[PDB]
Symmetry: D2
Subunit: 144 residues, 4 copies
């Protein structure tokens, strides 16, 4: 079977409503827009609106992810003081495969765009997996 090329996509982001990000995987009122999923590679891209005081549940990146913090301030891997990074808008980060994000948090109301290659493994304190959340999970939470 001859395969065709993949269609290009365009999203007018201000004509897409924010949705609450699942409470199972965050606290403090985080909202999101899913922008794209790639079913073949398993990559996906989203933007997040994160109130001051908000955070994501503990997780591990199984593939590389890259972010552009456009507004605010984000502590990753503990924040700069703890030997991680404190992203301050405008900030770019490369979170490598295997990166462990125990409590990514937002000291200031923030907005960040992130692309992910593959899923996030949400983990218990002992590192055991709770949920493996990737493109398909994202698409369903966004659109189903």
């Amino acid at each position: 079977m001859l395969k065709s090329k993949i269609k290009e996509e365009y999203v007018q982001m201000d004509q897409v409503d924010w949705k609450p990000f699942p409470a199972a995987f965050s606290t403090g009122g985080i909202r999101w827009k899913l922008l794209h999923v790639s079913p073949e590679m398993g990559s996906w891209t989203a933007i997040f609106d994160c109130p001051a005081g908000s955070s994501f549940a503990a997780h591990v990146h199984v593939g590389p992810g890259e972010y552009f913090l456009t507004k605010g301030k984000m502590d990753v891997r503990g924040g700069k003081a703890a030997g991680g990074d404190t992203a301050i808008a405008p900030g770019y980060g490369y979170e490598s495969a295997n990166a462990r994000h125990d409590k990514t948090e937002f000291p200031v109301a923030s907005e960040f765009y992130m692309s992910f290659l593959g899923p996030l493994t949400f983990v218990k304190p002992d590192g055991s997996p709770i949920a493996v959340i990737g493109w398909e999970d994202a698409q369903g939470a966004w659109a189903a």
Copy 2:
């Protein structure tokens, strides 16, 4: 101060002994040779020696995998009779991101080479994750 290109690799495969593949994730005394891991993308490549009756524990591919069955016969996604496939050497298979392999098994003594983008999530019958096994887990099981 600038990043370098990644080094090329070569493995003389017949000068590498088969090692036992982890019992936690397989049955039947499967052996393997780990050939490559890619830390950045999280891909990994190995060849497997699979006795008749052997199998891998239930798992989900979080990214694409590609196999070359060089000897024997493998039932994947339940075998062709079940709407899956039954690979017979020489066979090639593309296992797409999110492919669910509840019991990939070998009715005949077999050998196959396979590359994996990202981890395999080994799952309980309800789909709960047991372990997410990726490049560094493969390396770790091979090394020592």
Copy 3:
């Protein structure tokens, strides 16, 4: 040889100066910041500052690319009127492998962040390759 995991990275983007984007591949005064290169996969990520009236030379994406237009307006694949897209900030686009970008242009002063998997093939009107420009080329133009 045991391989280690890839280091995470952080770039404070407002402490990095804009550089002129090569005249060989653009017109109208485009500036850029290279944010990241991935030597293994060949991916790279940059942000661009594009004056009104500016454009990039004709090119083909050999892999997928994704952009976030944070300011302004960008005509891609001819613009919406011509059957491409007119990105209007805030806009997201997925430019698939093989996408042909004859004259990506900026009717309004714009800023966009883009990630690229693999190089761009800059082409002559007849489609013949002039230059294949990827992570390594980007890193050298940025940093050497």
Copy 4:
């Protein structure tokens, strides 16, 4: 309206005839079987039947490639004597992004399986691009 998972594939390789590999990019009467193309990422996978003395035209890998030499002997990056490698079956090789293969050649009748992420840029001796040959080019050469 939501994107579907990519379909799995299977090829019974012995029920596919060898076809001639393009003369534009090789010497010696190499034959091949194209096994898979991935439109989204731009990867592709094939097996090659290479007569003694055969070779591929000078090229650069824009992304990683991985080969399994199942029969014979291949000199890559000039052969091991030149600081390259000389693969002897059974051999595995990782050819990293940006690997320059001026004359990959076969001193003995050989066969190898290889997966490619992205295109090969075939080059003139000065490094100028002649042709960028990727998944869709492979498909096109195979199909008809």
